[PDB]
Design a protein around this ligand. Structure first.
Ligand code: MG
Ligand code: MG
Ligand code: MG
Ligand code: MG
Ligand code: MG
Ligand code: MG
Ligand code: MG
Ligand code: MG
Ligand code: MG
Ligand code: MG
Ligand code: MG
Ligand code: MG
Ligand code: MG
Ligand code: MG
Ligand code: MG
Ligand code: MG
Ligand code: MG
Ligand code: MG
Ligand code: MG
Ligand code: MG
Ligand code: MG
Ligand code: MG
Ligand code: MG
Ligand code: MG
Ligand code: MG
Ligand code: ZN
Lengths: 99, 135, 213, 22, 62, 132
RNA sequence: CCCAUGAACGAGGAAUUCCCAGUAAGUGCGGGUCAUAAGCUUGCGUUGAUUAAGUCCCUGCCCUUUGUACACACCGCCCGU
RNA sequence: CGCAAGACGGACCAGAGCGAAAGCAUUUGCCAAGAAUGUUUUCAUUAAUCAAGAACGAAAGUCGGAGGUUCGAAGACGAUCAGAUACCGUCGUAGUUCCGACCAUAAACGAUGCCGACCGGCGAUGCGGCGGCGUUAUUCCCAUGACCCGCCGGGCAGCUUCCGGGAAACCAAAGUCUUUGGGUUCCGGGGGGAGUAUGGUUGCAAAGCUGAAACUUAAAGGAAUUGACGGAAGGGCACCACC
């Protein structure tokens, strides 16, 4: 029995999609199938923000950000709880989680 | 023991923080980056490969580096942070933040932070196989 | 055995005259024992200085590579070696629902300096745009790329290094490109991403001084 | 037995048979 | 750093592996305008005073 | 836990709907009323029912309750609902009307209306939420 | 019952039990068993606290979604030499 | 700070585009192609599907050259384990790269032949054309670009629906089927033996295509429902849990 109408990927209208590598386990996964997450995070965490700002030499320096695109293979996404399993009806919802 | 600089002015050096998942490098060198002043690693502080990349070893290394640099007359530091890069991970290891905070609390003045990790345009083949690492 | 920092002498690094702030920092090097010369090891060095430090109230996401060419009396005489954009700013503009246009030119200045200039622009979204994406067609992309290439060529090849850096400090080339390509497709974040030095003439003192105030 | 490995074993047997009736 | 007091203004919740810490909001007795979140270990109620030896960390929200 | 069971709640609801006139805000009169009009074989159950009846009397005092339905109370409720303003809100000296509905009214043969004031139409055709 | 004799034991390793108020724990007393008999058990008073007003971290146990080739139901089913 | 050698074209990159399918992503130039749209051009049935026969055809593999960065079957070790000829780690051959000849196989998948007609809605999206206030490049001129509101046509799709089907999952085709006939190609007939033996044919080889029988067996199998279980994810509870 078919589980998903899109077969768990986003390949429509084309034959082949370039392989990419899982950032965790280094697995060859098609780019459309892979689970991608864009992380924008402060280089200095909120715990050390006060210490960094106090020890700075400039005024209103604004700490830099870090931009990383993580690509995960389905197994790693499930194991790392990035994505979860849902009910047969909840699977159809494509709306991103509120967060 | 160093440059003759007035009290209000601060001497500047750059610090390379290589935060891998095996250990952490704290490497202070000149603004040009050619002459080094202090380079001590997490492995030089903890005698256990487990803790080589721990925040504790990074904290100790940062404190040692900051003390030596203060003894050498540099009061302000330029921070550039690096991960393994290449085809491997791009997120810095756990020691980066601990080292940064440790050298902040050590009286060092902080310049401008930058993220310099090797970002390939399109690299070679990653080490893991087609099925990847299975542990 | 003996600490090598006792045998190392300090030196001061000076920025060229195009920048308001001349003193940029200090540099240590070993003394002159025989064949080894302090000046020789103090020459081929590059300094990565943010524009906020070189200028007074300029944007901080631009960095300049300054290379030293001569040393006289505890002073390092540096000249322009290149220009880059900071990693955070470069990563902050590449968004997922717009087209990114890039170009590069190997154009040489009047004073014999062969450069390579990289330019990046991004398609803008109209204030009343309802469509999520703002993509430019391939012909529009090629037109924008040609305009960028010709603008950089015109701006560089008719001037010398000093005037090129003077125009690069406030990014006049990017504003010119945004003005030019507005008819083809509106551009949003137009910048001269990277400038690298491909070739230089023979070292000549008189021009150096000139440059170095 | 997996079908792929069953086919592999059958191919090994065929190779032995072909080499034997040279 | 000196030792300074802070009055509890509202009990935020329970945190810890076994729910042993009360995460709380405290406003400083002298400044009276700056407030932070800290975890306090023991039975806490409205209006009691916690002496902070360190006084600039913030407990993680939730 | 002081959560009442369905026995208490249904008994109280029926008692209130049947004998609303005799009840009030007093627990000690309500419990006597309950023990007079009902057959509750336990004193504790009687007290629980009377307490919930008192709570519900207070609740109906400031409005309606989804469980109760008192026949006499509905008449007064619709009497309150019979509010009528002095001037109808639909009686307006001038009502604004778009050119399109003005044309529609003209096609209706009602183009001679005087109260209509033809307001200017919108300029920008931006009535859709951006997608993304 | 008496008189003698006078051992280990100086607070107990890994590991574990039971407990939220007249409670734990000290302390006796009754009932049963009982010709003779309580270091047991079942009840009773008497003296009377520390700490907590929380959480799923450990241990279970419930759900809910999900997978199954199980349905004697994972102590299942099942593959090859 | 430089030099070199090979590989690869990140982010932009989408349920977006192109190609008959495998497949296709740095700039620029050249070369020949191509669908759709536009059309009061032209021919005038020239068409649809296809035994035979042809072109192309992932990866791996085979002969020659060139090159060999990274990765890496085999192999040599180090760990883990009761054992590990594995999972993890170190090195590392063939290969991975280019050119020229073979190979013609994939879960080569939409597990859904191609052509044509009819049968519900809705919002988007890519290309082309047709309209329309009003904003932007501009500062003034028509432009033509970027938006905005519609329409038409061909596409990749999506949501919805008591169209109707179906064992059902589901499908706007998998509908217009006992109210059974639009045209046409391939192909299946309980499960094994078996895609095996044999013969033929292609190939340097590995192998490809065609392809049985004896014998054995009452089931094998598909969807869906309840339980039970899980080394899956979430909650909740208890001093025979914890704090
Ligand atoms: Mg197509
Ligand atoms: Mg394919
Ligand atoms: Mg638990
Ligand atoms: Mg399944
Ligand atoms: Mg069965
Ligand atoms: Mg690229
Ligand atoms: Mg044929
Ligand atoms: Mg061929
Ligand atoms: Mg091939
Ligand atoms: Mg090959
Ligand atoms: Mg070869
Ligand atoms: Mg290797
Ligand atoms: Mg072995
Ligand atoms: Mg290996
Ligand atoms: Mg086949
Ligand atoms: Mg098939
Ligand atoms: Mg269009
Ligand atoms: Mg138009
Ligand atoms: Mg369309
Ligand atoms: Mg039929
Ligand atoms: Mg066919
Ligand atoms: Mg059969
Ligand atoms: Mg044969
Ligand atoms: Mg055949
Ligand atoms: Mg099934
Ligand atoms: Zn993975």
């Amino acid at each position: 029995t078919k589980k998903r109408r899109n077969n768990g990927r986003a390949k429509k209208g084309r034959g082949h999609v370039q392989p990419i590598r899982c950032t965790n386990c280094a697995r060859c996964v098609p780019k459309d199938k892979a689970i991608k997450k864009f992380v924008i995070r402060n280089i200095v965490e909120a715990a050390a923000v006060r210490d960094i700002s106090e020890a700075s030499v400039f005024d209103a320096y604004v700490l830099p950000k870090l931009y990383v695109k993580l690509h995960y293979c389905v197994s790693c996404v499930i194991h790392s709880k990035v994505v979860r399993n849902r009910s047969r009806e909840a699977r159809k919802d494509r709306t991103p989680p509120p967060r | 023991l160093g440059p003759q600089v007035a009290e209000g002015e601060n001497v500047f050096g750059v610090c390379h923080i290589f935060a891998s998942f095996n250990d952490t490098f704290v490497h202070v060198t000149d603004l040009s980056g050619k002459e080094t002043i202090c380079r001590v690693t997490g492995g030089m502080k903890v005698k256990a490969d487990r803790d080589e990349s721990s925040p504790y070893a990074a904290m100790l290394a940062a404190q040692d580096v900051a003390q030596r640099c203060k003894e050498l007359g540099i009061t302000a530091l330029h921070i550039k942070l690096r991960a393994t890069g290449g085809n491997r991970t791009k997120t810095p290891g756990p020691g980066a933040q601990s080292a940064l905070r440790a050298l902040a609390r050590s009286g060092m003045k902080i310049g401008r932070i930058e993220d310099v990790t090797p970002i390939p345009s399109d690299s070679t083949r990653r080490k893991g196989g087609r099925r990847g690492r299975r542990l | 055995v003996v600490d090598p920092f006792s045998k190392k002498d300090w030196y001061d690094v000076k920025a060229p005259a195009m920048f308001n702030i001349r003193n940029i920092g200090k540099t240590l090097v070993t003394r002159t024992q025989g064949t080894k010369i302090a000046s020789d090891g103090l020459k081929g060095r590059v300094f990565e200085v943010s524009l906020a430090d070189l200028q007074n109230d300029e944007v901080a996401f631009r960095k300049f590579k300054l290379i030293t060419e001569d040393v006289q009396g505890k002073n390092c005489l540096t000249n322009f070696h290149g220009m880059d954009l900071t990693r955070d700013k470069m990563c902050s503009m590449v968004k997922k629902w717009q087209t990114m246009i890039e170009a590069h030119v190997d154009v040489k200045t009047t004073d014999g300096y062969l450069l390579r200039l990289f330019c990046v622009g991004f398609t803008k979204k109209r204030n009343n745009q309802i469509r999520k994406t703002s993509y430019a067609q391939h012909q529009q992309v090629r037109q924008i790329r040609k305009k960028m290439m010709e603008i950089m060529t015109r701006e560089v090849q008719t001037n010398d290094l000093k005037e090129v850096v003077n125009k690069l400090i406030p990014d006049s080339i990017g504003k010119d490109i945004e003005k030019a390509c507005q008819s083809i497709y509106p551009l949003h974040d137009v910048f001269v991403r990277k400038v690298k030095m491909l070739k230089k003439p023979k070292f000549e003192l008189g021009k150096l001084m000139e440059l170095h105030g | 037995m997996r079908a792929k490995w069953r086919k592999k074993r059958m191919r090994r047997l065929k190779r032995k048979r072909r080499k034997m009736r040279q | 750093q000196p030792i300074k007091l802070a009055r509890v203004t509202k009990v935020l919740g329970r945190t810890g592996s076994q729910g042993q810490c009360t995460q709380v909001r405290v406003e400083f007795m002298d400044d009276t305008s700056r407030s932070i979140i800290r975890n306090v270990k023991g039975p806490v109620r409205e209006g009691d005073v916690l002496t902070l030896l360190e006084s600039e960390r913030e407990a993680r929200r939730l | 836990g002081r959560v009442r069971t369905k026995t208490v709640k249904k008994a109280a609801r029926v008692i209130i709907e049947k004998y609303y006139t005799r009840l009030g805000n007093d627990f000690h009169t309500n419990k006597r009323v309950c023990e007079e009009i009902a057959i509750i074989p336990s004193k504790k159950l009687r007290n629980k029912i009377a307490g919930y009846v008192t709570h519900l009397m207070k609740r109906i005092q400031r409005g309606p309750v989804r469980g109760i339905s008192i026949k006499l109370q509905e008449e007064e409720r619709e009497r309150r609902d019979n509010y009528v303003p002095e001037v109808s809100a639909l009686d307006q000296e001038i009502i604004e009307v778009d050119p399109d509905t003005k044309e529609m009214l003209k096609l209706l043969d009602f183009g001679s209306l005087s109260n209509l004031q033809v307001t200017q139409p919108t300029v920008g055709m931006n009535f859709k939420t951006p997608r993304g």
